Symmetry: C2
Subunit: 243 residues, 2 copies
C-alpha cells in the first residue's frame, strides 16, 4: 500500500551541521535555520504534512540518528546523512538529495599530499582523528586500518576542529560540502588536501517499507528537476568570508 | 523481504554502447550482449545468488517505454543508463543510484554554438533541435526550452540522432555525459560536445513499486559502490579513446 502525506504529522529528526542545520540560541529559545530547514518548508508546502522538527541531542552521531529513527524516535530524518550499505540494512532512504564525497582536512603547513600518505603510514594512526558513527569511520576501517579502531576518536565536528588546531591530531575526514564551507568561512587556518574519495549520496532516512515512500521520492525528484535543490545549495553554500 | 538466491529474474536491458553492446554474429544468426551492464549483472548475481534471464528490449524501445514495460510486468527489474525522474517514480521504484549523471549538447564539429543559450535565443530553429522521444532529454527540453511545446525534431533512437546530425538535418541534440564522451571519443570523431553540463541526475535500476526485494538489491549496490567495483567497471568500459 501507498498513501499521501497530506495532513500527516511527521517527527523530523535533524542534526547540527552548518549550513545544513544551524542552531542559534536567542532570547530564551533556540532557532533552527539552513538548507535543511528550507528544504523541509518546500516539501511541507508541496506535500501538506505538519512538520514536527526535532533536533538530535548534542554529540548524537550520524549512525545514532539513523538508529534512533529505526527505533521509532522519529518518522524521517533529514540532513547531510550518507547512504551506506550498513544503514540501508536497517532503514530506507529517499531518492538522493545530493551527491557527496569526502576530503582530507588538516592545518595549513602540515606536510600531507593526500590519501596515500595515510595508507602508507606517514601519519601515526592515533593522529588521524575520526568522528565515530560516521561514514568517514567506515571508510577508515575498510581502507586504512583493516578493521582496527586505532584512530583518535572524535565525538563531534567541534572536537575535530579543536583537535586539529591544538595539534592533537594531524588530519581528519569531512564531506566535501561542509569541508569547503568551514575552511572557507570559519577556520581560515585549516585547509583541504588530496583528491576527494568515497563518492556517495545524501538521502532522507525513512522507515523500511514506508507507506509514504513514493510521495516523498516524487517530490524530491521534482525539486531537483525544477532547480530548487541547486538554488538552495547556492543560497547556503556559495559564500567565503576567509581572506 | 528475504533472499533471491535461486530465484529467476527477468532483467530488461536496452542497447547503449558501452552499457549494453549488442553484436550479431553469423555461421544462422545469434546475438551476443556485453558491456558495463552485463558485468554489473554478473557481480550482483554472484553476491545475491539469483538466476539472470537477460532480455534485450526490442529495437527503438524508448527509455520511458522500457520503464512502462516493466510497470506492465514484462520484466522483474531493468538495468541500464536509465535516468531517475519524478514522472517515472510515479509508476516504478528505483534502486539506490548506480551512477551520477548529467547531460551535454551534442553537435557536429565546427558548429558555431557556445551552449544552451543558443537553443533558447532562436539561433537554432526548433525543428533543427533533435530530441529523442521518451527520454529525460525530452522532459528537459519541454521544461526549459519550449514551454511545453513539442516543436522539436523527434528522434526514435541514438542511431537516428547521429545520422540526422551527420546528414545536416538537425544541428544539436542532448546526450547523457558518460555515453556522450564515449561516442565522441570512440565512434563519431566529427561530432563533439559543447556548453555546460545540465540536468544533474542519477541512474538507477528500475524495480516494481513496493518491491519485496528492494532492500536486498539496495544493500548490494551500495556494497559494490563502497568496495570500488562500480568505479572499476566505469574505468573498464569508459576510459577508452580511439579518436585522434
Ligand atoms: Cl589523494
Ligand atoms: Cl563532514
Ligand atoms: Cl526497505
Ligand atoms: Cl551552456
Ligand atoms: Cl544518451
Ligand atoms: Cl563522425
Ligand atoms: Cl513505491
Amino acid at each position: 500500500g501507498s498513501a499521501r502525506l497530506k495532513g500527516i504529522t511527521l517527527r523530523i529528526g535533524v542534526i547540527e551541521s552548518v549550513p545544513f542545520t544551524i542552531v542559534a540560541n536567542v532570547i530564551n529559545t533556540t532557532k533552527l535555520t539552513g538548507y535543511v530547514l528550507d528544504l523541509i518548508e518546500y516539501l511541507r508546502d508541496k506535500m501538506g504534512f505538519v512538520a514536527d522538527v526535532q533536533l538530535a541531542p548534542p554529540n548524537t552521531s550520524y549512525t545514532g540518528l539513523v538508529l534512533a529513527l529505526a527505533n521509532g524516535d522519529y518518522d524521517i530524518a533529514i540532513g547531510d546523512i550518507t547512504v551506506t550499505s550498513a544503514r540501508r540494512e536497517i532503514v530506507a532512504f529517499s531518492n538522493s538529495i545530493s551527491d557527496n564525497s569526502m576530503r582530507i582536512l588538516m592545518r595549513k603547513g602540515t606536510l600531507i599530499d593526500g590519501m596515500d600518505d595515510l595508507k602508507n603510514g606517514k601519519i601515526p594512526y592515533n593522529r588521524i582523528g575520526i568522528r565515530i558513527g560516521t561514514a568517514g569511520e567506515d571508510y577508515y576501517l575498510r581502507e586504512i586500518s583493516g578493521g582496527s579502531r586505532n584512530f583518535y576518536p572524535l565525538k563531534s565536528r567541534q572536537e575535530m576542529y579543536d583537535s586539529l588546531l591544538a595539534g592533537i591530531i594531524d588530519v581528519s575526514f569531512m564531506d566535501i560540502g561542509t569541508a569547503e564551507y568551514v575552511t572557507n568561512n570559519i577556520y581560515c587556518n585549516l585547509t583541504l588536501v588530496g583528491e576527494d574519495f568515497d563518492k556517495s549520496t545524501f538521502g532522507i532516512v525513512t522507515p523500511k517499507e514506508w507507506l509514504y515512500a513514493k510521495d516523498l521520492d516524487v517530490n524530491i525528484l521534482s525539486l531537483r528537476e525544477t532547480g530548487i535543490l541547486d538554488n538552495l545549495k547556492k543560497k547556503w553554500f556559495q559564500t567565503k568570508a576567509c581572506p
